[PDB]
Design a protein around this ligand. Sequence first.
Ligand code: HEM
Ligand code: HEM
Lengths: 119, 115
Amino acid sequence: NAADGIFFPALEQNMMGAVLINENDEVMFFNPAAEKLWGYKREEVIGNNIDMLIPRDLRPAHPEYIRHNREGGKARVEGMSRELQLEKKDGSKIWTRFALSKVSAEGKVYYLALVRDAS
Amino acid sequence: GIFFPALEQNMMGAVLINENDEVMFFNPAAEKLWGYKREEVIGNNIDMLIPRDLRPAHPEYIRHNREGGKARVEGMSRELQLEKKDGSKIWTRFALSKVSAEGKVYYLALVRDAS
Ligand code: HEM
Ligand code: HEM
């Protein structure tokens, strides 16, 4: 259905990680590039909340960042690009470069974060 | 699906090309970076999006990557000078990726402003 097209294999085989979340903050997408950055397999991330991929010191503040952007609207205005400290499964930390993007589809709101290594 | 709307409404520009270096996709983020509308770019060759001083050399670099077979693209790692329609120049950052789709080879260049 989607794998037979061109847009799914673009994000799936991208050099950058790709973490899509639906309106309920559930990770519906997690390509192999994001598996190497976070150290998580696809089975451990899909279906679960977004806060598992957030560092533990940033867990208190992150649910309030997402909630505010959902109530805002702003005639749709993607987001931003900056460097953030990613926390892996094993507890180690690497610096990265995120590129967050709001994406409306079928009256709902999603978020795709394109990540790469910045060390 | 949610995959077309994701790249269409991405803050980063998105320039997909097919086997014959023809631009199949050009989202509104890439419209602002290059000064070209998507109507002007779709169907035509990649040549226009390449700077004029790099026009002759660039087609050989793409052809060499196709014959190699390698999955990961190691080129275009550091900052590069994009050339707009009007002739002015801005600095950017490219994240190039080989995409095996539809039994052919593609290339998606995700771009941003690194000014
Ligand atoms: C390495 C893991 C991540 C870290 C450390 C992180 C960090 C942050 C920080 C610090 C902010 C506050 C805005 C700012 O930076 O000034 C933020 C905002 C936000 N994040 Fe993340 N983030 C991570 C992953 C993600 C992912 C995967 C998503 C969803 C795909 C996401 C969705 C959002 C959203 C929707 C906002 C609100 C944007 C705004 O209005 O400022 N985050 N994040
Ligand atoms: C701003 C416009 C662009 C500039 C200035 C540019 C510049 C360059 C340069 C100088 C090289 C050779 C040096 C190197 O690999 O580091 C190169 C390689 C390459 N470029 Fe571009 N490029 C541009 C746009 C694109 C686009 C839109 C695509 C396709 C989506 C593309 C695909 C490739 C490929 C496949 C290679 C070969 C890399 C390798 O052999 O690993 N380029 N580019």
